[PDB]
Every structure is written in structure tokens, then in C-alpha cells.
Amino acid sequence: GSSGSSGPQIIQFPEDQKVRAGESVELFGKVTGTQPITCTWMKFRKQIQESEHMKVENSENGSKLTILAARQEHCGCYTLLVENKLGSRQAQVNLTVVDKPDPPAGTPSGPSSG
Numbered sequence: 001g002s003s004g005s006s007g008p009q010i011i012q013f014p015e016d017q018k019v020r021a022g023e024s025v026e027l028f029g030k031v032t033g034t035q036p037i038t039c040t041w042m043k044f045r046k047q048i049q050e051s052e053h054m055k056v057e058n059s060e061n062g063s064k065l066t067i068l069a070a071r072q073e074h075c076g077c078y079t080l081l082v083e084n085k086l087g088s089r090q091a092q093v094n095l096t097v098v099d100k101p102d103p104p105a106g107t108p109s110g111p112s113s114g
Contacts, residue, residue, distance in 0.1 A: 007087025008033040014093050019070045021099035029080040029091055031062040037084040039063035044076050072097050
């Protein structure tokens with residue numbers, strides 16, 4: 001007798017977001033299924049390389065991909081792959097790097113400035 005254990009799936013994952021050049025982002029994709037479970041972080045059909053700019057923490061709950069000192073090149077669509085004796089899965093998320101400060105303000109009764 002057994003219930004579920006169909007395959008690795010990503011129920012949680014970040015969507016198209018932005019990031020300031022130099023800031024720090026944390027992209028985690030919760031995965032469910034039957035452990036052990038493999039998880040790889042790639043981008044634009046290119047496996048990411050763990051470095052002082054991009055860190056990865058592979059764990060049960062899922063896989064995380066930290067981006068230190070976000071660079072202009074870091075900007076792009078990533079892909080979280082998760083394979084396991086059961087099956088496999090692949091997600092996608094768009095990212096954009098901005099080296100500009102906070103956006104302009106001009107809302108009525110907003111920041112209450114001026």
C-alpha cells in the first residue's frame with residue numbers, strides 16, 4: 001500500500017521579479033515527492049556554477065539559489081531542475097538587474113511628502 005509518490009514537483013517558486021545591481025536575492029523552489037531528490041540550478045540552458053556571486057543550497061524541502069552582488073549579466077531567465085527515481089520537473093523564472101535608485105514618486109496622499 002502506498003499513496004502519492006508520483007514524482008518531484010515544484011509547488012513553490014518565485015515569478016518574474018527584479019533586483020538592484022549588487023543586491024542579494026534568494027530563489028527557492030520547494031519540491032515534493034520521494035527522497036532522495038536531485039535538484040540542479042541552471043539558466044538559459046546553462047547550469048549555474050556555485051561562486052561568491054551565486055550560491056546554492058540543495059536540501060530536502062527543495063533547492064535554493066542565492067545571488068550575491070547581483071550583476072547586470074545575472075539578468076536572465078533561470079531554470080530549476082528536479083529529478084528523482086520517480087520522475088523529473090523543470091521550472092522557469094525571469095530576472096532583471098537594475099543599477100538605478102528608487103523610482104519616482106507622484107501619488108496623491110501617498111508618501112505625504114511636499
